[PDB]
Design an enzyme around this catalytic site. Structure first.
Site, PDB file in Angstrom:
ATOM      1  N   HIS A   1      17.068 -29.056  32.536  1.00 25.10           N
ATOM      2  CA  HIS A   1      17.436 -30.357  32.329  1.00 25.10           C
ATOM      3  C   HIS A   1      17.597 -30.887  30.940  1.00 25.10           C
ATOM      4  CE1 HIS A   1      12.820 -31.322  31.534  1.00 25.10           C
ATOM      5  NE2 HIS A   1      13.490 -32.131  30.926  1.00 25.10           N
TER       6      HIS A   1
ATOM      7  N   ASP B   1      13.829 -25.173  37.118  1.00 22.49           N
ATOM      8  CA  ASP B   1      14.353 -25.956  35.840  1.00 22.49           C
ATOM      9  C   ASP B   1      13.905 -24.911  34.593  1.00 22.49           C
ATOM     10  OD1 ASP B   1      14.791 -28.087  34.238  1.00 22.49           O
ATOM     11  OD2 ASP B   1      12.956 -29.194  34.380  1.00 22.49           O
TER      12      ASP B   1
ATOM     13  N   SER C   1      10.011 -32.161  26.697  1.00 18.87           N
ATOM     14  CA  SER C   1      10.690 -31.449  27.938  1.00 18.87           C
ATOM     15  C   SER C   1      11.295 -29.854  27.332  1.00 18.87           C
ATOM     16  CB  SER C   1      11.993 -31.991  28.200  1.00 18.87           C
ATOM     17  OG  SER C   1      11.738 -33.058  29.142  1.00 18.87           O
TER      18      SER C   1
HETATM   19  C1  LIG Z   1       5.028 -34.446  31.777  1.00 21.07           C
HETATM   20  N1  LIG Z   1       6.297 -35.254  31.598  1.00 21.07           N
HETATM   21  C2  LIG Z   1       6.268 -36.807  31.535  1.00 21.07           C
HETATM   22  C3  LIG Z   1       7.298 -37.318  31.610  1.00 21.07           C
HETATM   23  C4  LIG Z   1       8.568 -36.928  31.183  1.00 21.07           C
HETATM   24  C5  LIG Z   1       8.598 -35.391  31.091  1.00 21.07           C
HETATM   25  C6  LIG Z   1      10.004 -34.845  30.747  1.00 21.07           C
HETATM   26  N2  LIG Z   1      10.826 -34.670  31.738  1.00 21.07           N
HETATM   27  C7  LIG Z   1      11.622 -35.435  32.120  1.00 21.07           C
HETATM   28  O1  LIG Z   1      11.723 -36.678  31.631  1.00 21.07           O
HETATM   29  C8  LIG Z   1      12.455 -35.397  33.388  1.00 21.07           C
HETATM   30  C9  LIG Z   1      13.826 -35.098  33.092  1.00 21.07           C
HETATM   31  C10 LIG Z   1      14.565 -35.911  34.409  1.00 21.07           C
HETATM   32  C11 LIG Z   1      13.663 -37.121  34.902  1.00 21.07           C
HETATM   33  N3  LIG Z   1      12.492 -36.483  34.494  1.00 21.07           N
HETATM   34  C12 LIG Z   1      11.269 -36.988  34.819  1.00 21.07           C
HETATM   35  O2  LIG Z   1       9.861 -36.529  34.503  1.00 21.07           O
HETATM   36  C13 LIG Z   1      11.203 -38.078  35.822  1.00 21.07           C
HETATM   37  N4  LIG Z   1      10.108 -39.069  35.333  1.00 21.07           N
HETATM   38  C14 LIG Z   1      10.729 -37.841  37.254  1.00 21.07           C
HETATM   39  C15 LIG Z   1      11.737 -37.151  37.992  1.00 21.07           C
HETATM   40  C16 LIG Z   1      11.194 -35.789  38.376  1.00 21.07           C
HETATM   41  C17 LIG Z   1      12.195 -34.868  38.998  1.00 21.07           C
HETATM   42  C18 LIG Z   1      13.548 -35.285  39.357  1.00 21.07           C
HETATM   43  C19 LIG Z   1      13.836 -36.631  38.877  1.00 21.07           C
HETATM   44  C20 LIG Z   1      12.892 -37.247  38.248  1.00 21.07           C
HETATM   45  C21 LIG Z   1       7.405 -34.552  31.251  1.00 21.07           C
END
Ligand SMILES: C[n+]1cccc(CNC(=O)[C@@H]2CCCN2C(=O)[C@H](N)Cc2ccccc2)c1
Ligand SMILES: *[C@@H]1O[C@H](CO)[C@@H](O)[C@H](O)[C@H]1NC(C)=O
Ligand code: NA
Ligand code: NA
Lengths: 11, 251, 28
Positions: free
Chosen positions: B43, B99, B198
């Site tokens: 991602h 991922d 990330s």
């Molecule tokens: C522990 N953590 C907390 C917040 C963000 C992150 C980093 N990942 C992210 O920000 C990712 C990228 C896409 C949307 N993300 C998310 O984490 C979304 N907030 C939740 C989500 C999960 C699965 C599919 C769609 C959306 C890690």
């Protein structure tokens, strides 16, 4: 904000 | 990283920063797994819901860093990308299943006191260490709070959570290619990854051979460090067959 | 790598970082 990196890496 | 601390110098010498060329900015974390290969979250490179689809020439990787924003002359090394490989079954549509992505560097990076690869787990090390309660370590330059940014690399140690508790914490469909980590509300301690972290590594130090292994990749979470929520990590060992295939084919 | 996961400034020198013991203690 970010310090500019050497130009060589952006070419 | 929320509720973490400043890393020590050379504490995470496999830590990699994914850096956007223009505008110049942090994109993600990543990890060094050999002199030519960097591991990250898919991602970080491809996420259509946010109009994200990077090509090799869009990006740099910065290795050996401690400061988030400084150019760390004589310490960090900056590498260009030869090729990006994203897992062919990465599920960006639903739940970020699988991922994971690899990036091959144009030229090998020189190892130093500050730059050194992490191990990838074998089946036995994974079976031994991926247990509820066992702690790993997450590092990154991401947000210090859900809703700013750190001066230097942050670190936090977090326990792996029982799969049923992970599942019951969220409406998102969890898969065997993920695990979750973090403290429970009743545990008194806190900490989590956040946006900007990330792609960074969740590592564990094997007590059998005293080497660090990358068990997870920072993948997703709902908010950061919320009570009753947990961070979710890509299960590196479960996807190792793909990793090996890419490296064997393109190495 | 044969040398993967061994940090130059820690394992290679037999120095421990400030919190790795927390991890070891959790491996019960
Ligand atoms: C522990 N953590 C907390 C917040 C963000 C992150 C980093 N990942 C992210 O920000 C990712 C990228 C896409 C949307 N993300 C998310 O984490 C979304 N907030 C939740 C989500 C999960 C699965 C599919 C769609 C959306 C890690
Ligand atoms: C992303 O970029 C590639 C190449 O530019 C393109 O072919 C692809 O269709 C785009 N969208 C994806 C992979 O979802
Ligand atoms: Na659920
Ligand atoms: Na939480």
């Amino acid at each position: 904000d970010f310090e500019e990196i050497p130009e060589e890496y952006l070419q | 990283i929320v509720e973490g601390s400043d890393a020590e110098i050379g504490m995470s010498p496999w830590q990699v920063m994914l850096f956007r060329k223009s505008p110049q900015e942090l994109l993600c974390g990543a990890s060094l797994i050999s002199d030519r290969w960097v591991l990250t979250a898919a991602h970080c490179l491809l996420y259509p819901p946010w109009d994200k689809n990077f090509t090799e020439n869009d990006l740099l990787v910065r290795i050996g860093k401690h400061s988030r924003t400084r150019y760390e002359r004589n310490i960090e090394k900056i590498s260009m990308l030869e090729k990006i490989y994203i897992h062919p079954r990465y599920n960006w549509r639903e739940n970020l299943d699988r991922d994971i992505a690899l990036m091959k560097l144009k030229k090998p990076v020189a190892f130093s006191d500050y730059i050194h690869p992490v191990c990838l787990p074998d089946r036995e090390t994974a079976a031994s260490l991926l247990q509820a309660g066992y702690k790993g370590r997450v590092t990154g330059w991401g947000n210090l709070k859900e809703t700013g940014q750190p001066s230097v690399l942050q670190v936090v140690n977090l326990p792996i959570v029982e799969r049923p508790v992970c599942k019951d914490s969220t409406r998102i469909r969890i898969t065997d290619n993920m695990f979750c980590a973090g403290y429970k509300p009743d545990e008194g301690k806190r900490g989590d990854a956040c946006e900007g972290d990330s792609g960074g590594p969740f590592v564990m130090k094997s007590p059998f051979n005293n080497r660090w292994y990358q068990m997870g990749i920072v993948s997703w979470g709902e908010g950061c460090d919320r009570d009753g929520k947990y961070g979710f990590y890509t299960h590196v060992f479960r996807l190792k067959k793909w990793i090996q295939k890419v490296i064997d084919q393109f190495g | 790598e044969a040398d993967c996961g061994l940090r130059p400034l820690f394992e290679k020198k037999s120095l421990e970082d400030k919190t790795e013991r927390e991890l070891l203690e959790s491996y019960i």
